[PDB]
Amino acid sequence: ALLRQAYSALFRRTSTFALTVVLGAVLFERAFDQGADAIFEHLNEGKLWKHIKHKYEASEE
Amino acid sequence: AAKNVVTQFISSLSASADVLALSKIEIKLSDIPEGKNVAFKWRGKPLFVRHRTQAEINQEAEVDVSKLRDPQHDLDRVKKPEWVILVGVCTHLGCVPI
Amino acid sequence: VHNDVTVPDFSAYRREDVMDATTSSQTSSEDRKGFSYLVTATACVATAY
Amino acid sequence: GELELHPPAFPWSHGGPLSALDHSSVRRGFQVYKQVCSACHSMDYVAFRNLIGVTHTEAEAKALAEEVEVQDGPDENGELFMRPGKISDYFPKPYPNPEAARAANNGALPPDLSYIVNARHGGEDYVFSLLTGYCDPPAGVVVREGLHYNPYFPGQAIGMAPPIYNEILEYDDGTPATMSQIAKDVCTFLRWAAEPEHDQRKRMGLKMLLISALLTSLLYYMKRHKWSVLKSRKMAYRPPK
Amino acid sequence: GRLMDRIRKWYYNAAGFNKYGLMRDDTLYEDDDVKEALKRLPKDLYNERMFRIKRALDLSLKHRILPKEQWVKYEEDKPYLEPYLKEVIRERLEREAWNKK
Amino acid sequence: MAPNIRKSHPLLKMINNSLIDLPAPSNISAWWNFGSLLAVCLMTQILTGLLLAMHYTADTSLAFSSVAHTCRNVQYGWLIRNLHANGASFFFICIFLHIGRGLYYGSYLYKETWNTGVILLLTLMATAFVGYVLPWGQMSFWGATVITNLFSAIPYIGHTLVEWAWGGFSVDNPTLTRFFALHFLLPFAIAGITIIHLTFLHESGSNNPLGISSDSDKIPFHPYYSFKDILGLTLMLTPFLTLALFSPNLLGDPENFTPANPLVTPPHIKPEWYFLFAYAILRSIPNKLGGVLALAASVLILFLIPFLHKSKQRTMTFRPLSQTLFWLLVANLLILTWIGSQPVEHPFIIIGQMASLSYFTILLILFPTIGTLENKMLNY
Amino acid sequence: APNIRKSHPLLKMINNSLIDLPAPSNISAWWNFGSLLAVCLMTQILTGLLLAMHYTADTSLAFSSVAHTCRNVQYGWLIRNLHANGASFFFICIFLHIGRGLYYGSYL
Amino acid sequence: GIHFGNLARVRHIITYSLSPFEQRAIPNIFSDALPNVWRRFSSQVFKVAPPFLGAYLLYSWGTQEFERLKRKNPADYENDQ
Numbered sequence A: 001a002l003l004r005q006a007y008s009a010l011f012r013r014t015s016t017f018a019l020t021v022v023l024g025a026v027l028f029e030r031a032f033d034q035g036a037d038a039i040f041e042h043l044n045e046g047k048l049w050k051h052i053k054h055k056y057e058a059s060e061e
Numbered sequence B: 001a002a003k004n005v006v007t008q009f010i011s012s013l014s015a016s017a018d019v020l021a022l023s024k025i026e027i028k029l030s031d032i033p034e035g036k037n038v039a040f041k042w043r044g045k046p047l048f049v050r051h052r053t054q055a056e057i058n059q060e061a062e063v064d065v066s067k068l069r070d071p072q073h074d075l076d077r078v079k080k081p082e083w084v085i086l087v088g089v090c091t092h093l094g095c096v097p098i
Numbered sequence C: 001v002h003n004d005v006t007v008p009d010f011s012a013y014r015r016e017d018v019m020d021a022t023t024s025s026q027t028s029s030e031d032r033k034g035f036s037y038l039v040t041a042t043a044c045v046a047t048a049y
Numbered sequence D: 001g002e003l004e005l006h007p008p009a010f011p012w013s014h015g016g017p018l019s020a021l022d023h024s025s026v027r028r029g030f031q032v033y034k035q036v037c038s039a040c041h042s043m044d045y046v047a048f049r050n051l052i053g054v055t056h057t058e059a060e061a062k063a064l065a066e067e068v069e070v071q072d073g074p075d076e077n078g079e080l081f082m083r084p085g086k087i088s089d090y091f092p093k094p095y096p097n098p099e100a101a102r103a104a105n106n107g108a109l110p111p112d113l114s115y116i117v118n119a120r121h122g123g124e125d126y127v128f129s130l131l132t133g134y135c136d137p138p139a140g141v142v143v144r145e146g147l148h149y150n151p152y153f154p155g156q157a158i159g160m161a162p163p164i165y166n167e168i169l170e171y172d173d174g175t176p177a178t179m180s181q182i183a184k185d186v187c188t189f190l191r192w193a194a195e196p197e198h199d200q201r202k203r204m205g206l207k208m209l210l211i212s213a214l215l216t217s218l219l220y221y222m223k224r225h226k227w228s229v230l231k232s233r234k235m236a237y238r239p240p241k
Numbered sequence E: 001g002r003l004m005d006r007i008r009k010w011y012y013n014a015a016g017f018n019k020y021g022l023m024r025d026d027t028l029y030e031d032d033d034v035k036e037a038l039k040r041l042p043k044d045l046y047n048e049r050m051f052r053i054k055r056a057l058d059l060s061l062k063h064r065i066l067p068k069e070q071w072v073k074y075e076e077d078k079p080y081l082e083p084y085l086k087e088v089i090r091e092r093l094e095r096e097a098w099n100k101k
Numbered sequence F: 001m002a003p004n005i006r007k008s009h010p011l012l013k014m015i016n017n018s019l020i021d022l023p024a025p026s027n028i029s030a031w032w033n034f035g036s037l038l039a040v041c042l043m044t045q046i047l048t049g050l051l052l053a054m055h056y057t058a059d060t061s062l063a064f065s066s067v068a069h070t071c072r073n074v075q076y077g078w079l080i081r082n083l084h085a086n087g088a089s090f091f092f093i094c095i096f097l098h099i100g101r102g103l104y105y106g107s108y109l110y111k112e113t114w115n116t117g118v119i120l121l122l123t124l125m126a127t128a129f130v131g132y133v134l135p136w137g138q139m140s141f142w143g144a145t146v147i148t149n150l151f152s153a154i155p156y157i158g159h160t161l162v163e164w165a166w167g168g169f170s171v172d173n174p175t176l177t178r179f180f181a182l183h184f185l186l187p188f189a190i191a192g193i194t195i196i197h198l199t200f201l202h203e204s205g206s207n208n209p210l211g212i213s214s215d216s217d218k219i220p221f222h223p224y225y226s227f228k229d230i231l232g233l234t235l236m237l238t239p240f241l242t243l244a245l246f247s248p249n250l251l252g253d254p255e256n257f258t259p260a261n262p263l264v265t266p267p268h269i270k271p272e273w274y275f276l277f278a279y280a281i282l283r284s285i286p287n288k289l290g291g292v293l294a295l296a297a298s299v300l301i302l303f304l305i306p307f308l309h310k311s312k313q314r315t316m317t318f319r320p321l322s323q324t325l326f327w328l329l330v331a332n333l334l335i336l337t338w339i340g341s342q343p344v345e346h347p348f349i350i351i352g353q354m355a356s357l358s359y360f361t362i363l364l365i366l367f368p369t370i371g372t373l374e375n376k377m378l379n380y
Numbered sequence G: 001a002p003n004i005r006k007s008h009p010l011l012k013m014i015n016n017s018l019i020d021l022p023a024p025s026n027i028s029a030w031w032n033f034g035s036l037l038a039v040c041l042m043t044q045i046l047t048g049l050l051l052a053m054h055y056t057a058d059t060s061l062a063f064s065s066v067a068h069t070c071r072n073v074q075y076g077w078l079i080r081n082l083h084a085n086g087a088s089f090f091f092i093c094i095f096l097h098i099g100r101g102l103y104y105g106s107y108l
Numbered sequence H: 001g002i003h004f005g006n007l008a009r010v011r012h013i014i015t016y017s018l019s020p021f022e023q024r025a026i027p028n029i030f031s032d033a034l035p036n037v038w039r040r041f042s043s044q045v046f047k048v049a050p051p052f053l054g055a056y057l058l059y060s061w062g063t064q065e066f067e068r069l070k071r072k073n074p075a076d077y078e079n080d081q
C-alpha cells in the first residue's frame, strides 16, 4: 500500500515532508520540461531553427 | 519663513530659465496650392496655413454671426480672403483638429 | 437532558473506508491522510517549480 | 466619406496559440526587406545579431553586416570615418532624417517597419492585403497625381507605389517568387520583427496551461478538504425545558 | 380590495428570506435603535432569533436553503421586534425634541 | 505573561492579529476574494514595476526607445513589461468587482473603510494614467495633453495649474520626468492607504452576504480564507497569464506603438479600456466645464452612496427590485464603455447622453427611491 | 468617547505616540536627535523628489541634468544644496544619536 | 486586537462536525451539488440576464444603424446627369 508506505515514510514527519517536496520538485522539473518542449517542437515540425539549421550550419563552404 | 520656503519650492516646478520665448516663421504661399491646409511646427504646437477657394470663402462669410458660440465674422479673423491662418489647437482640451 | 442527545448520521459524507460502524477506523487512517497529504505535497512541488 | 474596406483573415502558420513562426518563411521575409523595402523603410530596432539562431548562421549574419558601410568615430583628429558593419549594428537607415525621407518620396514618410504589424489594425493581415491589393480607382474617384489607388489604405490614396511584382527578386532557396508568395513571406518577417519573443512566449504559454491546470486542481481539493469540516456541519437548537 | 395584501404577500415571497427560515425581523440591519430593541427582547425570544440567524448563516456558507416545507409563511411571520423598536424610536424622538426646547 | 510567541511579540502579534487569528464570517462568498487579489496585484505591480524602472529613461528623446530596448534586449524584459501592463488591467477588473460587491452588499455602510476605498480607486487611476504616459507613444502624449488640460476648466488658477503640470508651456520633457517621479511614488502611497483601509475595516469586521450579524458564527481567517484566497488567486492568475502569454495586446490600444507626434492627434484616440466609461461621459456634455464636472462626478459620486441608503435591510439579497436596478446599472456602465470606444457621431452621441443620464439617475434618484418603496412593501 | 483624541482609530495614534506619550522628565538634549533624525528624513525625501523631477538617469545625461537643475531650475541650486548638505547633517545627527545610546546604555 | 470571546451571547446550540480525514471533499456531486447549481441559476437568471440581453440589442442596433448610414441612398443621384 503506497499511500500508507508514503504517509509513514514521507508525509508524516514535517521534516521529511520538505525533503520530498524538494527532491520531488527537482524530478518534476527535469521531466515536465522535456515533455513540454517535446510537445511544442513536435507541434511545430520544420518551422523552428532547430530544424532548418542543418542547411547552412557548416554545410556550405 | 514658511511662506517663503514654499514660495521657492513651488516655483521650482514652474518653467525653468532655459525655456525660451522665440521668434517668427516665413512661409511661401506657393507651396500651399489652392484647396489645401498644411501644418508647420511652431512655438510648440501646430500652425495652420490654409489657401481657401472662393467656393468656401462664401460659406464662411454667409452664416448667422449671432448663432455662434464665439461670434466673429470670417472677415475680421483673416486678412486676405484666400488665406486663413490659425493655431491648430482645439480650445476644449488641446488636441489637434483634423 | 444530555442523555437524549446523539450525533446525527454522517454517512452522506463519510469516506468509503470509515462508513461501517463496526470496523476500526484506524486501519484506513494511514491512507486517508497519505492521500490528502499527497495532494498537498504535490501542490507544493508544482508551486516550488 | 468615412467608408473603408477591412482586410480578411488569412491562416498564418503562426496564428495558433501554440504555433511558432515558420523560420524558413522569415529568412525569406528578411531577404525581401533587405533587397526591396530597406530602400525606403528603416528598421531601427532590429540588428544583424538578432538574425543569428533565428534565421541565419553566425557566419551569414556577420557577412550580412559587413556588406554595409557604417559611420563611426571620432578618430584621433576627431574625424568621423567609414567602416564595415559588425553584427552589433542596427539595420541601416535609408535616410538621415524624416525631412529627407519625405524629400525623396513626394513628401510621403515611409514609416519605420520595426513595430508596424502592431501599429496598424489588421497586423500582417492588413499589410498583406495592402501590398497585394493595388488596383484601379472606381467610377467617380480621381486620385491626386503622385499618389496611387489602394482600396485597403484609409483614404484609398496611398503614397507608396506597389513595391512588389513577380520575380522582382529571387529566393536563393528555390521558392517560386510569385507576388503573393513574396508578400506572404515579408509579412511573416514583419511579425518576427515586431516581437522576436513570439515563439518563446508561446512555449511558455504551454507550460503555463499545464501547470495552471494541474495546480488549480490540487488547490481546489485542498480548499474543499479543509472546508469540509464546515460544509458537513450539523447544528440543532435544544433549549432547556 | 385586497390589493396591498396581494402585493405585500408577493414581495414577501419575492424577498426569499423565508427560504432561510428568517422572520422579516431577523433581517433588519442593526443600527442604533435596532441594537437597543434587541437588548429589550425577552431571553427566549432572543435565543430563538439567534439560532434562526446562526442557522441561516450556516445555510449560506453551504450554498443551500431549507426544504420548501420549512419555509416561513407570509401570515405566520411573527414581527417579534417591531413593537419594541417602535418604542425605542419613540423614546428617542422625545429626547431629541426636548433638547431643542 | 504570554505563552505563545505569536500573541506577545510586537510584530508577529500583528501578522497573527490581522491575518491568522482574525475573526471572519463563515459565509463570505467568492465576492470577498477580491480584497486579497487587489492586494496581491499591488505587490506584483510594484515588483515588476521596479524591475522596469531599472531600464527606463525618463526623457522624451529616450523614453520610447528605452522601453523598446527593455523588451528586445533585457533578458525576460518582454515578459516583465507584459506582466506590468496587463497587471494594470487585471488590477482594474478586480477593483471593479471589489466595488460592485460593496455596492450590492451594502458594505459602504462601513463609511471609513469605504471612503478610503474611493481614495484608493482615485489613486490607482492617477497611477495607471501616468504609467501609460512613460513609453511616450501617441496615446501617451495626447493623453498627457488632455488630462493635464482638464485643470484649464477651473477658473483663474486654472491656466496656471496647467503650467506646473507641464513645467513649461506645452507638454515636453519636464512633464515626462515629473510623471515618472509621480508614477514611481504613488504605488507606495497606495500600499500605505491600503493599510489604513484594512485597519478601519478591522474595527467592525467583514460584512457577509445575508447582511446580518455573524458574531454567532465567526471562523479563523487561517486556514479557511487563506486557502480560499490561494485558490481565488490561481483562478484569476490563469486568464491573466493566458491573456498576457497568448494574446499580449488584446487589451491594449495600438496607437502607443507610434512615437509621440506633437503635431498629429490620431483620429482614433481612445484611452485604456478602464477609463472609457468616463471618457464616454466627458463626451456627452457638449460644454467644456459641464463635461469636466460630469467626469469628476462620474467617480466622486461614490462618496455619496453611503448617504443614499434607504433600505431597512443591509444587502440586496432579499430586495428583488434593488437587484434589477443594480444589474440594470451594471449593463448601464457596460454600454458607456462601448460608447467610449466609438466615434462622436449618431446614433452613438444620442445613446451616449442617455446612458450617462441613466447612470446618474439610477444612483441619485432611483436606488434611494425603490429602496424606500421596498420598505413599505415589507410593512415597515 | 469622551474625547475624540483617544477613540478615533487615527488621532488616537497621533495622540498615543506623540502627545500623551509618557516621557521621562529628565531627558537631556542628547535625546533631541531622534526628532532631528526624523525631520531630516522628511526634509531629505521632500527635496529629493523635487530633484528627481529634473534628473535623468543616463550616463550621457546625468551630469548635465544636475548642472541644468541648478543653473536653470528656479531655486534648483538651493534645493540641490539643501539635499546634499542634508545628507551630512543627517549623518552628524545620526552619529550623536548613536553615541548618546552608547554612553547611556540605551542599547539595552 | 482579540475578538474571539467577546463577539456575542449565545445559548443552547449544539453543533457536531467531523474531521476532514473522515469525510469526502466534494460529496454527492450529482444528487446534491449540480441540483443546486441549477436551483440557483434558475432563481437568478431572470433578474440578471434581462438587462444584459437588453443592452445587447441596443448594441447590435446602434451598430448596424451606424453602418446603414454609411451606405448610399439611390434617391440622391437618380436625377443627376
Ligand code: HEC
Binding pocket: D032, D033, D036, D037, D038, D039, D040, D041, D105, D108, D109, D110, D111, D116, D120, D127, D131, D157, D158, D159, D160, D161, D163, D164, D186
Ligand atoms: C519607394 C519607397 C518604398 C518602398 C521601396 C516600399 N515602401 Fe512602403 N511605403 C512607402 C511610402 C512613401 C509609404 C507612405 C504612404 C503614405 O503614408 O502616404 C509607405 C508605407 C508603407 C506601409 C503602410 C503605411 C500606412 O500608413 O499604413 C507599409 C505597411 C509599407 N509601406 C510596407 C512596405 C513593404 C512591406 C515594402 C517592401 C516589400 C515596402 N513598403 C517598400 C514607400 C516605400
Ligand code: HEM
Binding pocket: F031, F032, F033, F034, F035, F036, F038, F039, F042, F095, F098, F099, F102, F106, F107, F108, F110, F113, F114, F116, F117, F118, F120, F121, F124, F190, F194, F197, F198, F201, F205, F206, F207, F208, F302
Ligand atoms: C488598493 C485598493 C484596494 C485594495 C487592495 C483593497 C483591499 C481590501 C481588502 C483586502 C479587503 C478585505 C477582504 C474583502 O472583503 O474584500 C477590503 C474590504 C473592503 N474594501 Fe477594499 N480594497 C481596495 C479598494 C477598495 C475600493 C475602491 C473600495 C471602495 C469603492 C473598497 C471597499 C471596501 C470595503 C467596503 C470593504 C469591506 C468589505 C466587506 O463588506 O466585507 N475597497 N478591501
Ligand code: HEM
Binding pocket: F042, F045, F046, F048, F049, F050, F051, F052, F053, F056, F067, F081, F084, F085, F088, F091, F124, F127, F128, F129, F130, F131, F132, F133, F134, F135, F183, F184, F185, F186, F187, F188, F190
Ligand atoms: C499602482 C501599481 C502600478 C500600476 C497601476 C502601474 C501601471 C503602469 C501602466 C498602466 C504602465 C504603462 C504600461 C504600458 O502599457 O506600457 C506602466 C508602466 C511603467 N510603470 Fe507602472 N505601474 C505601477 C507601479 C509601478 C512602479 C512602482 C514602478 C517602478 C518602481 C513602475 C514603473 C513603471 C515604468 C518604468 C513603466 C514604463 C515602461 C513600460 O511601460 O514598460 N510601475 N505602469
Ligand code: HEM
Binding pocket: G030, G031, G032, G033, G034, G035, G037, G038, G041, G094, G097, G098, G101, G105, G106, G107
Ligand atoms: C533613521 C534613523 C533613525 C531615526 C530617524 C531614529 C529616531 C529615533 C527617535 C525619534 C527616537 C526617540 C527620541 C530619542 O531618544 O532620540 C529614537 C530612540 C532611539 N534610537 Fe533611534 N533613530 C534612528 C537611528 C538609530 C540608530 C542608528 C540607533 C542605533 C545605533 C538608534 C538607537 C535608538 C535607541 C537605543 C533609542 C532609545 C533612546 C533612549 O534610550 O532614550 N536609532 N530613535
Ligand code: HEM
Binding pocket: G041, G044, G045, G047, G048, G049, G050, G051, G052, G053, G055, G066, G080, G083, G084, G087, G090
Ligand atoms: C535617505 C535620504 C536621502 C539621502 C541620504 C539622500 C542623499 C543624497 C546624496 C548624498 C546625493 C548626492 C548629493 C550631491 O550632489 O552631492 C543625493 C542626490 C540625489 N538624490 Fe538623494 N537622498 C535622499 C533622498 C532622496 C529621494 C527619496 C529622492 C527623490 C524622491 C532623492 C533624489 C536624489 C537625486 C535626483 C539626486 C541626484 C542629483 C543631485 O545630486 O542633486 N534623494 N541624494
Ligand SMILES: CC(/C=C/[C@@]1(C)[C@H](C)CCC(=O)[C@@H]1C)=C\Cc1c(O)c(Cl)c(C)c(C=O)c1O
Binding pocket: F019, F022, F024, F032, F033, F035, F036, F039, F040, F198, F201, F202, F206, F225, F226, F229, F230, F233
Ligand atoms: C491580502 C490577504 C491575504 C494575503 C496572502 C498573501 C496571505 C498573507 C498568505 C497566503 C496568500 O497567498 C494570501 C493571498 C488577505 C486580505 C483579507 C483581509 O485583510 C481581511 Cl481583514 C479579510 C476579512 C479577508 C477575507 O477574505 C481578506 O482576504
Ligand SMILES: CC(/C=C/[C@@]1(C)[C@H](C)CCC(=O)[C@@H]1C)=C\Cc1c(O)c(Cl)c(C)c(C=O)c1O
Binding pocket: F122, F125, F126, F127, F129, F139, F142, F143, F144, F146, F147, F269, F270, F271, F272, F275, F276, F278, F279, F282, F295, F296, F299
Ligand atoms: C478618463 C479620464 C480621466 C480620468 C481621471 C482624470 C479622473 C477624473 C480622476 C482621477 C485620475 O487621475 C484620472 C486619470 C479622461 C478622459 C480621457 C483619457 O483618459 C485619455 Cl487617456 C485621453 C487620451 C483622452 C482624450 O481625449 C480623454 O478624453
Ligand SMILES: CC(/C=C/[C@@]1(C)[C@H](C)CCC(=O)[C@@H]1C)=C\Cc1c(O)c(Cl)c(C)c(C=O)c1O
Binding pocket: G018, G021, G022, G023, G027, G031, G032, G034, G035, G036, G038, G039
Ligand atoms: C519626531 C518627533 C517629533 C516630531 C514633530 C514633527 C511633532 C509631530 C510636532 C511638532 C514638531 O515640530 C516635532 C519636531 C519626536 C520623536 C520622539 C519620539 O518618537 C519618542 Cl518615542 C520620544 C519619547 C521623544 C522624546 O523627546 C521624541 O522626541
Ligand SMILES: CCCCCCCCO[C@@H]1O[C@H](CO)[C@@H](O)[C@H](O)[C@H]1O
Binding pocket: A037, D200, D203, D204, D207, D208, D211, D212, F237
Ligand atoms: C503559475 C503558472 C506558472 C508557469 C510556470 C512556467 C515557467 C516558465 O518556464 C520557462 O520556459 C521557457 C521555455 O520553455 C524557458 O526558456 C525559461 O527559462 C523557463 O523559465
Ligand code: FES
Binding pocket: B090, B091, B092, B093, B094, B095
Ligand atoms: S473636442 Fe476635446 S480637445 Fe477637441
